[PDB]
Design an enzyme around this catalytic site. Structure first.
Site, PDB file in Angstrom:
ATOM      1  N   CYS A 159      -8.346   8.964   6.376  1.00 38.86           N
ATOM      2  CA  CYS A 159      -7.969   8.775   7.723  1.00 38.86           C
ATOM      3  C   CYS A 159      -6.779   9.521   8.281  1.00 38.86           C
ATOM      4  O   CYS A 159      -6.923  10.325   9.234  1.00 38.86           O
ATOM      5  CB  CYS A 159      -8.233   7.353   7.963  1.00 38.86           C
ATOM      6  SG  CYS A 159      -9.704   6.399   7.554  1.00 38.86           S
ATOM      7  N   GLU A 181       0.862  -1.353   0.087  1.00 37.04           N
ATOM      8  CA  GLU A 181      -0.070   0.140   0.077  1.00 37.04           C
ATOM      9  C   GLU A 181       1.017   1.373  -0.118  1.00 37.04           C
ATOM     10  O   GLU A 181       0.504   2.237  -0.530  1.00 37.04           O
ATOM     11  CB  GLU A 181      -1.058  -0.098   1.202  1.00 37.04           C
ATOM     12  CG  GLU A 181      -1.673   1.343   1.553  1.00 37.04           C
ATOM     13  CD  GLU A 181      -2.291   1.412   2.590  1.00 37.04           C
ATOM     14  OE1 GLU A 181      -1.925   1.116   3.900  1.00 37.04           O
ATOM     15  OE2 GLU A 181      -3.581   1.802   2.601  1.00 37.04           O
ATOM     16  N   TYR A 210      -4.495   9.152  -1.546  1.00 34.34           N
ATOM     17  CA  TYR A 210      -3.163   9.433  -0.891  1.00 34.34           C
ATOM     18  C   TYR A 210      -2.080   9.743  -2.129  1.00 34.34           C
ATOM     19  O   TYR A 210      -1.577  10.915  -2.418  1.00 34.34           O
ATOM     20  CB  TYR A 210      -2.555   8.171   0.020  1.00 34.34           C
ATOM     21  CG  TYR A 210      -3.650   8.308   1.322  1.00 34.34           C
ATOM     22  CD1 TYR A 210      -3.452   9.294   2.212  1.00 34.34           C
ATOM     23  CD2 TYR A 210      -4.382   7.211   1.444  1.00 34.34           C
ATOM     24  CE1 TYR A 210      -4.235   9.102   3.384  1.00 34.34           C
ATOM     25  CE2 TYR A 210      -5.291   7.052   2.598  1.00 34.34           C
ATOM     26  CZ  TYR A 210      -5.289   8.042   3.434  1.00 34.34           C
ATOM     27  OH  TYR A 210      -5.776   7.966   4.585  1.00 34.34           O
ATOM     28  N   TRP A 250      -7.961  -2.079   0.380  1.00 33.43           N
ATOM     29  CA  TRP A 250      -8.863  -1.291  -0.333  1.00 33.43           C
ATOM     30  C   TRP A 250     -10.064  -1.782  -1.158  1.00 33.43           C
ATOM     31  O   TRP A 250     -10.617  -0.997  -1.618  1.00 33.43           O
ATOM     32  CB  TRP A 250      -8.010  -0.286  -1.470  1.00 33.43           C
ATOM     33  CG  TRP A 250      -7.187   0.924  -0.603  1.00 33.43           C
ATOM     34  CD1 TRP A 250      -6.014   0.674  -0.188  1.00 33.43           C
ATOM     35  CD2 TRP A 250      -7.545   2.338  -0.277  1.00 33.43           C
ATOM     36  NE1 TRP A 250      -5.694   1.954   0.417  1.00 33.43           N
ATOM     37  CE2 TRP A 250      -6.640   2.728   0.561  1.00 33.43           C
ATOM     38  CE3 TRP A 250      -8.921   2.858  -0.427  1.00 33.43           C
ATOM     39  CZ2 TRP A 250      -6.934   4.130   0.977  1.00 33.43           C
ATOM     40  CZ3 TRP A 250      -9.130   4.239   0.053  1.00 33.43           C
ATOM     41  CH2 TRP A 250      -7.973   4.674   0.638  1.00 33.43           C
ATOM     42  N   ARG A 299      -7.286  11.601  11.586  1.00 33.44           N
ATOM     43  CA  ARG A 299      -8.657  12.309  12.182  1.00 33.44           C
ATOM     44  C   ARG A 299      -9.512  11.065  12.681  1.00 33.44           C
ATOM     45  O   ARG A 299     -10.170  11.523  13.828  1.00 33.44           O
ATOM     46  CB  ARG A 299      -9.231  12.826  10.721  1.00 33.44           C
ATOM     47  CG  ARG A 299      -9.816  11.849   9.980  1.00 33.44           C
ATOM     48  CD  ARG A 299     -10.539  12.602   8.509  1.00 33.44           C
ATOM     49  NE  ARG A 299     -11.055  11.560   7.775  1.00 33.44           N
ATOM     50  CZ  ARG A 299     -12.231  10.576   7.702  1.00 33.44           C
ATOM     51  NH1 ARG A 299     -12.822  10.645   8.859  1.00 33.44           N
ATOM     52  NH2 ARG A 299     -12.237   9.817   7.066  1.00 33.44           N
ATOM     53  N   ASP A 351      -9.777   3.647  14.334  1.00 30.41           N
ATOM     54  CA  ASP A 351     -10.164   2.421  14.800  1.00 30.41           C
ATOM     55  C   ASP A 351      -9.023   1.699  15.437  1.00 30.41           C
ATOM     56  O   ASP A 351      -8.144   1.305  14.877  1.00 30.41           O
ATOM     57  CB  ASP A 351     -10.799   1.596  13.699  1.00 30.41           C
ATOM     58  CG  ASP A 351     -11.217   0.255  13.747  1.00 30.41           C
ATOM     59  OD1 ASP A 351     -11.467  -0.070  14.981  1.00 30.41           O
ATOM     60  OD2 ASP A 351     -11.270  -0.578  12.850  1.00 30.41           O
TER      61      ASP A 351
END
Ligand SMILES: NC(=O)C1=CN([C@@H]2O[C@H](COP(=O)(O)OP(=O)(O)OC[C@H]3O[C@@H](n4cnc5c(N)ncnc54)[C@H](OP(=O)(O)O)[C@@H]3O)[C@@H](O)[C@H]2O)C=CC1
Ligand SMILES: NC(=O)C1=CN([C@@H]2O[C@H](COP(=O)(O)OP(=O)(O)OC[C@H]3O[C@@H](n4cnc5c(N)ncnc54)[C@H](OP(=O)(O)O)[C@@H]3O)[C@@H](O)[C@H]2O)C=CC1
Ligand SMILES: CC1(C)N=C(N)N=C(N)N1OCC(=O)Nc1ccc(Cl)cc1
Ligand SMILES: CC1(C)N=C(N)N=C(N)N1OCC(=O)Nc1ccc(Cl)cc1
Lengths: 522, 528
Positions: B413, B305, B353, B327, B433, B436
């Site tokens: 995120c 990633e 991103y 994803w 922000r 989990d």
């Protein structure tokens, strides 16, 4: 000496009495027409109970052996003190009650409610009793005499940060005699700020070793001396929220990395701190030096309007962006084609029109780019559990067009049980000049968003990225660290204001700002 | 009994031994090899060893004098006891052990065969008598495997001061398997690096002006009816530990704060979470790689990633071809449609991103477009600022392009990275922000720590601190049971990350340039 053997502590609450210099003496209002000056302050009344009644028997033996060689607490009043108490609780919920009087004989109350003749006739009464410590509940005259005869050791002083009409005053505690050793958290009870301070009179442990072993690796790091943070290092408990700021100053003076900056002035820098302030309990306006809030409120109203016109501020004598708008400054930024005081697409532009093509500071941008301010308000009101409530000023595309990139990167908002918290992330923080203003700015902002969304402000959280103290600020900050904060003031917004765009300068009041004198940080 | 009176402690250092692997505390059992220690120098262990075995507290002896003299019916130095092989392993320059009363157990040797200030004993019994007739603070059993075995068997050790050396060496002698009914871990140190190995320090314990202390009780008159009352008996192990100094407790302790004090909210789906707002974690990447140990994590996916980010890719198909499904769900017809991205190809994740890192401000078209020299190449820029203007306070990389949010599959995120440079060392703040705690954050810690390594290396610096700022920090309610299991696991020493050091450019990394060494971890957990 008597006052260490017998354990004689005063316990008082003083409000303020009817430009203005402040000192501890500011707080002295004791009573009025035989009752307390204020209606009811239940947190201080609750503090009073806990302190006077609390007992620890496991440390009484050490008291019992010293006291002789010469379970409950003793509480000493004066007649007009004993009297003013509403009837239905006397004696006071299980304490050894005692009254210093002239024209009262011990006959016409109980045999637990021991009356005393004079001050000298109390030492008699203690050496013959089984008690933990001795609390002077006071009265003007009672405190005056017990202090005059160096009888008091510690003083449990409640600072009531509001003004009342008073007929009776606590005596001016001599600061070469006594000195503050502890300050509590700041609190709101009954529509006033208050805090709890402590004046002292001046002069398994398997796991305790395990602690030392675990410290086996620990390292004049910076040329900052011991004897200079005397008052600061001479406090035991520093729970006042202003210590969150002051302790970052200390950490960066003690442990900060020595660095050149672009100017060349020299900084001590560290990287990554949090501050949390409880907006439901105080307005965190630093008390260890005078701060002014008109400019920074105008700055905010300027942002909300979407303005990038440095001149709208200069004409109101708010000179926060004067240096960043000069020909010389814009030229060093390679902004050769930008009018003086045209600050380019900064905060206000980004909040109201993020993504729009910036032209000059006089164009009409109505309904161009993303109106983030509008967007976070709707989200707050219509989707309060959203984790997407960010106001972002750092627009990568436009950075080079800005007089300078935003010091304040973003606000993120959080909503629970009709309460609004805010995080501001600040990429670069001048702890000496900047940060105190920055805390006030986003606290006010947090209130403004709160009000127009029908929420109560909760926590303002300040995340510092590059946290620097200017070498040429260190003297001033040394003076500042060895000041003791006062209880914080409060912010009252005009409640009629219900949309973020309707606040004028008039709609902002700061109340009970009790502060130390100004410091030239230079 | 006899262990509490005479304060007889053991101190050891154990490495992993030559052997889809399962790990218990018996993983760390290797004591020595060919008469000596399995490793050359581990200086930090040796220094710990000296601090503990030579530390006395003058003032505390008086009460231990009393206690010991009572039981016998009646400068300060510690005693150290060692087997004869142990003693023979010490170099002459350090014999007898400085600032300590040396004792040696032996049958083959008597006083006559030693030049040195030492007591010789042939019986365990004889030691207890020796201690009776001596002034000492604490008695430490330095071992030899045989000495360790018999002082345990004789129920004589109050506590084992135990170094986990998180590397493998050829070993011929081993520490005894500690009975977990006999001994429980009560403390775990920070993790550290010394001579190219991580290690921590754990203490096993055996089972079966006081005026200003009152001022504390006062300044607490207004405390807690503690929100979500989950049961003590559940976090028995977690709360028993006295010192929780392992950097993994930085994550674990947030799980606890959210469980015990978290706000109950139903979220984007209609599920259920506990949330709080605003945490910071700091991880010293010069000392360890903070991959969590209280459950199993694989990094292949999250490294793919990150390489996919750096390439500027927005194409979910590239990750699925590498069997990385991170994803997949944000790329479906159902999902893109529910985000109103009706005109978006499956697995076209839009300007996320990668796109923002290399092309911030360019119009997104589709995931196949050549966006060369379009938009601001943030990644190149911050690599230049770190190299040429290291004191710059503007080395931010930002994924939160406000203009493009609605075109992404979901907003980022992980909002931004700010970088900091002092004395050839790079630190990284990452603002998250939405976190989990249960599935996301363990990975998010791993991703940005690897990223700091990559940037640091291609800029010729050394990684220092990775700082993780959590905004809305939340625990899914169906993760709660799984997280309870996890909080009662004791962390192991963190592994280490090796970057192929030939990579001088941020784009030139590939999967095989990434080696995690000495990952010691508890069992896989389904948070579901
Ligand atoms: N701010 C605070 O923390 C507190 C404030 N208060 C307020 O205090 C006010 C009253 O205080 P102030 O007017 O001094 O009243 P005091 O409580 O000090 O009462 C004075 C009386 O105590 C007796 N007394 C004092 N000194 C002596 C002495 N040396 N020898 C013998 N008797 C002595 C006399 O009683 P006699 O009448 O017999 O002569 C004197 O008139 C009230 O308004 C009350 O609400 C009360 C407690 C705490
Ligand atoms: N990793 C670590 O923390 C540590 C590792 N080590 C390593 O372990 C190895 C040495 O340990 P290991 O071989 O067990 O040997 P030991 O150090 O335990 O030596 C045992 C010897 O000491 C004597 N001895 C032990 N118990 C008694 C007793 N009850 N009564 C009389 N004599 C007794 C005997 O000596 P004799 O033969 O003279 O009769 C016995 O043969 C080395 O490699 C050393 O470096 C050592 C300490 C710590
Ligand atoms: C009440 C007050 C002002 N608060 C503090 N903290 N400390 C004191 N000494 N004050 O109280 C003395 C007193 O007279 N107390 C008292 C107790 C009960 C009632 Cl109802 C009214 C006053
Ligand atoms: C030193 C070592 C390996 N580490 C720990 N934590 N505990 C021990 N018991 N070990 O040392 C025992 C020993 O034989 N020590 C020793 C001391 C000095 C030298 Cl130079 C070599 C070995």
């Amino acid at each position: 000496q008597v006052c260490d053997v017998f354990d004689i502590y005063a316990i008082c609450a003083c409000c303020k009495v009817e430009n203005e210099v402040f000192n501890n003496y500011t707080f002295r209002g004791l009573g009025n027409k035989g009752v307390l000056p204020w209606k009811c302050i239940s947190l201080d009344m609750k503090y009073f109970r806990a302190v006077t009644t609390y007992v620890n028997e496991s440390k009484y033996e050490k008291l019992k052996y010293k006291r002789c060689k010469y379970l409950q607490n003793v509480v000493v009043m004066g007649r007009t003190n004993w009297e003013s108490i509403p009837k239905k609780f006397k004696p006071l919920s299980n304490r050894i009650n005692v009254i210093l009087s002239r024209t009262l004989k011990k006959e016409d109350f109980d045999e637990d409610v021991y009356i005393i003749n004079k001050v000298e006739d109390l030492i008699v009464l203690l050496g013959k009793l089984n008690y933990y410590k001795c609390f002077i509940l006071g009265g003007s005259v009672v405190y005056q005499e017990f202090l005059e005869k160096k009888l008091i050791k510690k003083i449990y002083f409640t600072r009531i940060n509001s003004t009342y009409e008073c007929d009776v005053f606590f005596p001016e505690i001599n600061e070469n005699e006594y000195q503050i050793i502890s300050v509590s958290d700041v609190y709101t009870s009954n529509n006033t700020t208050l805090d709890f301070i402590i004046y002292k009179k001046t002069n398994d442990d398997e796991e305790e070793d395990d602690f030392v072993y675990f410290n086996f690796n620990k390292e004049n790091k910076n040329s900052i001396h011991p004897n200079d943070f005397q008052i600061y290092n001479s406090l035991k408990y520093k729970y006042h929220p202003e210590y969150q700021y002051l302790n970052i100053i200390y950490d960066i003076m003690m442990n900060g990395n020595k660095q050149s900056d672009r100017t060349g002035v020299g900084v001590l820098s560290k990287f990554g701190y949090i501050m949390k302030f409880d907006l439901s309990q105080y307005f965190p306006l630093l008390t260890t030096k005078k701060l002014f809030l008109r400019g920074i409120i105008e700055e905010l109203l300027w942002f909300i309007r979407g303005e990038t016109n440095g001149n709208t501020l200069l004409n109101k004598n708010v000179r926060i962006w004067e240096a960043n708008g000069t020909r010389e400054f814009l030229d060093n930024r390679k902004l050769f084609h930008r009018e003086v005081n045209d600050l380019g697409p900064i905060y206000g532009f980004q909040w109201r029109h993020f993504g729009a093509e910036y032209t000059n500071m006089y164009d009409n941008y109505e309904n161009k780019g993303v109106d983030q301010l509008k967007n976070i308000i709707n989200l707050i009101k219509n989707d309060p559990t959203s984790r997407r409530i960010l106001l972002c000023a750092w627009n990568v595309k436009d950075l080079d067009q800005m007089a300078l990139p935003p010091c304040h990167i973003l606000c993120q908002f959080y909503v629970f049980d009709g309460k609004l918290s805010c995080i501001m992330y600040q990429r670069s923080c001048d702890l000496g000049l900047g940060v105190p203003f920055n805390i006030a700015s986003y606290s006010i902002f947090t209130h403004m968003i709160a009000q127009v969304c029908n929420l109560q402000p909760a926590q303002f959280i300040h995340v510092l990225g590059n946290a620097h103290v200017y070498n040429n600020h260190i003297d001033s900050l040394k003076i500042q660290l060895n000041r003791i904060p006062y209880p914080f003031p409060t912010l009252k917004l005009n409640p009629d204001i219900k949309n973020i765009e309707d606040f004028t300068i008039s709609d902002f009041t700061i109340q009970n700002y009790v502060h130390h004198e100004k410091i030239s940080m230079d």
